[model samples]
Target chain A: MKFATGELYNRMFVGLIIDDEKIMDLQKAEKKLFELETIPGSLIECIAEGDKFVAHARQLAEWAKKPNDELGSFMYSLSEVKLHAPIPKPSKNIICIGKNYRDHAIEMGSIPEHPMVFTKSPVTVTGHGDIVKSHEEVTSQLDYEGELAVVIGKSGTRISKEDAYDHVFGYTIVNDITARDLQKRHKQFFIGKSLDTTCPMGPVLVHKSSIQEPERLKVETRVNGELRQSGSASDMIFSIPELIETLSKGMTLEAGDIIATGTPSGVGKGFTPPKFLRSGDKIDITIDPIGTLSNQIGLE
Target chain B: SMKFATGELYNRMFVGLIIDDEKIMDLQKAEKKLFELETIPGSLIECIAEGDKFVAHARQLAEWAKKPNDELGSFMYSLSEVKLHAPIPKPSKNIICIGKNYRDHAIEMGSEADIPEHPMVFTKSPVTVTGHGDIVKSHEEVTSQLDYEGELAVVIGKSGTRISKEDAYDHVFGYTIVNDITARDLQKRHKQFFIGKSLDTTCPMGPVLVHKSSIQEPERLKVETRVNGELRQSGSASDMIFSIPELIETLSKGMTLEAGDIIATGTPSGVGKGFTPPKFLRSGDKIDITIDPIGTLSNQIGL
Candidate 1:
């Protein structure tokens, strides 16, 4: 099952994709079919409901296909509503793993013994199709990093690698937009990588049940109809479980936490001439099973 | 005009004004009584977002409580009777931190050449935050070198981008104290300060929020810390390599600094790692970080 959040007439609602091009409002369907208001308005809150929420979504997906008038009003074509980032305005910073791919590691510099962790502030999040700010005033060398990201479903501390997959809620796509100049000058990744609207995420969040092998998923990035980056999750230096275990060793990994697995090589900086992003450059990052996340650079 | 805090009594949290540092005047209850209006924000962050309007209402409430009135006494809670929380319990974003902003601290950590040319910034996840008097987890499983660095923290009252240093103070709401507890080994191994600096229960902040109106010269203020009643750090904000205004100016260059955003201006010279033999925190050791005109934040290491 695929879960999404969207805005209709400025009001946000939690939804489930019953088919390829249709969505059902879970709360409205729950009220119409079961007369129960069990679903939450926010995606983050719905995720915290854990298995209970997922179960309700699963039940609604099956019942809504019967073609009953009671549920007709709750359904809409995907074009009727505007989709938003799976978890917009996350309560905490998005945990990011840097240089997790050996090729990307080689292109940048060296591979470390442990997962290189950094974070992008919550304010940097923007939904699918949103115009990303170039911040031309502060930075000259802008770049993009297309990567696969997972959202945590449960909260825990000191989670072992074996128990890591149990904590995953689903997967989504993220464009880790960066300002190369600021990243170098400040000597910290927080400022350069965290400008507003730098992280564009989602089209939808595909539940963990839908994907059989997360490690084998294909991640591809295209800029202006030209392929720039292509890699497999299997190539990641630190697998998903390893990252979760390492991050949660002494810290608590809370539910709804978004962690972006590091990007593959072929970034703008790795090129001979360095192809930095200019105004009107279109970025589409596609990770199989999880749909493509696309965004454009704003005009200066 | 005065200090304020968020305190819990009977499992209910309320915005409060510090009265003589002995009692907390429940702003919610006081506003309901004096003006018969429940207009005050329920959370400290919301109150701060409302900016000067919230301060005006709190000031009026404080003034009314000052006059001798037996009826007003019911609205106040003794400091010892209620549990004090961080001014903003759950910050919207990670706490923005400045690294090696002090000359002496930079020298102690490395050499004098290690002093940063810019205000080196990093962040600690909000999960690390715990209130004053809370127990800081030793996290002995992962790190044996648990340490503490006390520093003055600034809270942004207004949202702005590309702010000038001359207009920097206009965005400041108030000041507080924060103990940036870290795991030295993790910090060195991770290459980035986040993982070590962002462990849960590592950030102990608040005792009170001293309004910017009260602190006329934040640069000259004194910051000191004590471990088990022994003074291990004694330094002045005047010794800072990057001034508060300069930090605000640099941080807001492109990114927006929203109201209730916290900035932990770097720690002073003496930390556990800076000592000759190293005095890392142990079980049951009490840590006190105090900034004059603000207050003290006290926490103990948990086994």
Candidate 2:
């Protein structure tokens, strides 16, 4: 079944039995359903039944195909839940896509030779609604580029492109935050992109089955409610299947490992008089059918 | 009167007694000896003793002195029966060594480019360490220039980080001997020194740890290495560009300095490269490193 994690009156709870067709404050229902004697797994099973969790999650989507009724009434009549990151805390490294977007290459003054790659140690990852702390000590030039992030459900290695989509668990949104000054100084992306709380991702992990056509979905980022980045997964030079297949060539991808599909162009830095993110700037990144991930900038 | 000291001070007492005979005295007439020296009022003396079992049971007492008379009188009457092991044989971490520290050695390797901007530091993994009398193997194909680098190795007692050079020695635990063996060919091939220097049974360290309290001035020690029976490396700790304290201060600037981390202060000029045709180690080579007072560590290289 579809689920989400959110904050209500400063208390966090799991949003269960989501009715996507008719929006509801499942977070409120979560508070009322606190005493329900069901483990998260059993709670999910009680909503829909199948041999596999994915199949049960698909059953919940079929329930959402209809409008709000007693059977799906709790699905759509809930208040707005303050979206926290989907996975509140991750225990492994956040896997990232390096050069998976073609137009992004021309913006950076380079050609896409191969999937140029690297990693940001776990210290860099933070959740949605968490402050994206600027590295004031090193640089004041901070920028945000929103991207699609895939959250793995199980561990696999040497995953072939043909069967790569089968290994995917769910999808989410991510802001690939960077410190421009340090990025230039170090001559490497890791040091600049790896400062603490630089990566803000999530709101909900849209299980793969819930998404009708992820490759055709619209992705957009707005600063202060004004659109800055507008693109689609169709624009990605290296598709999700190609990326998963290439990245897992040798290295093992563990459960909960996040692969951030490369961001499209239209970052603030691309402007002639570059508008760097400062303290108090709010960024809202949204992907259709999944949800929006919002975060605020703050001084270190 | 009989005098007493404990721990390292007690170990020093034995070493001092070995060099000077006047400290030796009779325990029975100790009370009369106290009153006779009134002019030296500060020199207070009294008989302080423990049961023979107390001395025998102490861990630090192994290198201090033989088990007291009563504890050992039954088996053997002499001190020779108890064989001494290396003083600080098993250290917690691998010893770190700096390569091409000296101008002459750097020149022999390549050129006098520039006084190194940064310490060219590498590690001797702990697997390579062995005590005195432990055989250092000349792994058949892997090593050739199995040279000896007789350098002052510092032992760290306390853990610290971001320490200034002025306060660097405060973190040093002690000092000991380290034989840094190298596979010169592999060192050149990888252009990285770690794998070449980290062959099993290559690093032989210790006979005893001369704790910082025992060393009045570590910089003044005369260090030398001998191969077979001939002097190979003859240098003083004074020639080191980066002193023990300075090395610790620099290394700990951004990293955690854990307890028992050893810094092998760089070696001197007189390595095998100094010879006419450049003599390298072969099947059977006995290496003996002697530093004043801290004693000598001798080990033989075997195939």
Candidate 3:
């Protein structure tokens, strides 16, 4: 079952992103459809309680497949609603991996033996169709990174690779936006990767069960509707299990923690004349089975 | 005027730790006895969000402490009663960190380490933080070379971007203690700051947050770190390569620095990793990080 947090008529709702474009408010849908009372309020709230919410959400998904007279009022077209990052204001920093893709590693000039990890400030998160501030005053080399992100469902430490998947809530698409100049200037990714509008996420969060093979999905990024980067998860130097095991080794990952599993090779910097974002440039990041996270670059 | 989360789980949770005192005031009880106002907030973060009025209110309470009357007596809880927690129990963002800010610490870290042109900024996840006196995981299974970097932590009160250095100190709310515990092995392996330095329970902070009004000079304060009652690290904030103003100016240049945001102004030389053979912590090892004005935060290693 897919989930989303969206705004409709000025109020935020924990919504179930069903079918191709419709969203059913989960809190109201569960009460009306399943007669289930007090299903956890928000998507993040539901995630903290473990699989029961997903089980209940799956029940809603069953009823959602057959849109009837009873379901008509509960559903709203995705375009009609304003989407927010699925885990808006992540409880902590968004943990990110660096140089996980072999081609990306080679292009960036090194292939590391272990996964290089860093973080994007949680404040950076903005949702689909949101304006990504160009931060023109501070950085001239603004860049885009489209990557698959894993959302943690459980809070645990010292998790083994075998048990890593058990802790996942689901997966989502993230545009790990960057400012290339600041990234070089600071030599630390935190501040450079952490400007206000640098993390554009969402459209929808698809469950882990939705992906047939967690390690074999496809990821691609496009700029102005033209494909700029493409790769299979099979090409990753470090797999999801390894990433999780490495991350959770003494580091506790909470329910809403997002681990952006690095981006593929073709970033704007890799081109001869770098293709940095312009004020009106549109970015589309798609990790199918998840969805496309779309955003437009804007000036201050 | 301020709220604090204190005590161990299942015993006692939040009571209250007022500004620079052992006297724990009941927030609601104080509201009734001190002021009949109904709009007071529930937590320290919320209280600080209300701004200067709360500061004046805190100062008034500090003023009342001098009178030693029965009315204020009801609010006081002795120092020995409650265990303190990190001021903000759960911060939304990780604490921003600096690397080798101190001159000697930079040279000790590496021969190549000259005074950096810009701040070598990094971060530690909030998950790494445990309350003062808490037992931090030794992380011996993952890392053999465990280390500690004790420094002063500055908490932000106001939000700003592109803040000029001249007016940077105006953004500070107060100061606290921070032990920037690390895994030296992981630090070398990852070639990055985040993973090695951010294992859970590695960042122990705050027995108390001394309000900025209480402190005359932030940069001249004395700081010390010890293990097993032996002094291992001693330094003053005056040794830092980049001043507090420079850090604030650099950090908030384009990024928004929110209220309650913490900045750990890098440690001095003499980290365990800097010593010969490295005096790494073993099981049950006790470490104490102390800063003058703010009390000591002593923690144990739970290997």
Candidate No. with top lDDT: 1
Count clashes in each candidate, considering only residues at least 3 apart in sequence or on different chains: 0, 6, 0
User: Local error of candidate 3 at B174, Å?
Assistant: 1.0
| Alpha-carbon shift of residue B260 in model 3 (angstroms) | 1.5
- Candidate number 3, chain A TM-score: 0.95
True-vs-predicted CA distance for residue B278, candidate 2, Å: 25
Candidate 2 per-residue C-alpha lDDT over B24-68 given as tens digits, one digit per residue, 9 for 90 to 100: 221112212322322211111110012222212222223223434
Over A117-209, each residue of candidate 2 has an lDDT whose tens digit, in order, gives 544445455666788875565567888889998876656666888888777777888898887765564343544565667778776677777
Can you tell me which runs of candidate 2 are displaced by over 4 Å? A7-14, A20-82, B1-303
Stretches of model 1 off by over 4 angstroms after superposition: A70-72
Q: Which run of 10 residues does model 1 chain A get worst, by summed lDDT?
A: A64-73
lDDT of each: 0.90, 0.60, 0.81
TM-score of chain B of each: 0.98, 0.74, 0.91
State the DockQ of every prediction. 0.81, 0.03, 0.78
Superior candidate under TM-score, 1 versus 2? 1
What are the per-residue Cα lDDT tens digits for candidate 1 across A78-177? 8898988989889999999899888998887658788778899888998889999889988879899999999999999899999999999999999999
Model 1 Cα lDDT, one tens digit per residue, B119-207: 78889998998999899999988899999999999999999988999999999999999999999999888887889999999999998
Please report how far candidate 1 places residue B41 from its true position, in Å. Answer: 2.1
Model 3: number of backbone collisions: 0
What's the TM-score of candidate 2 when only chain A is evaluated? 0.79
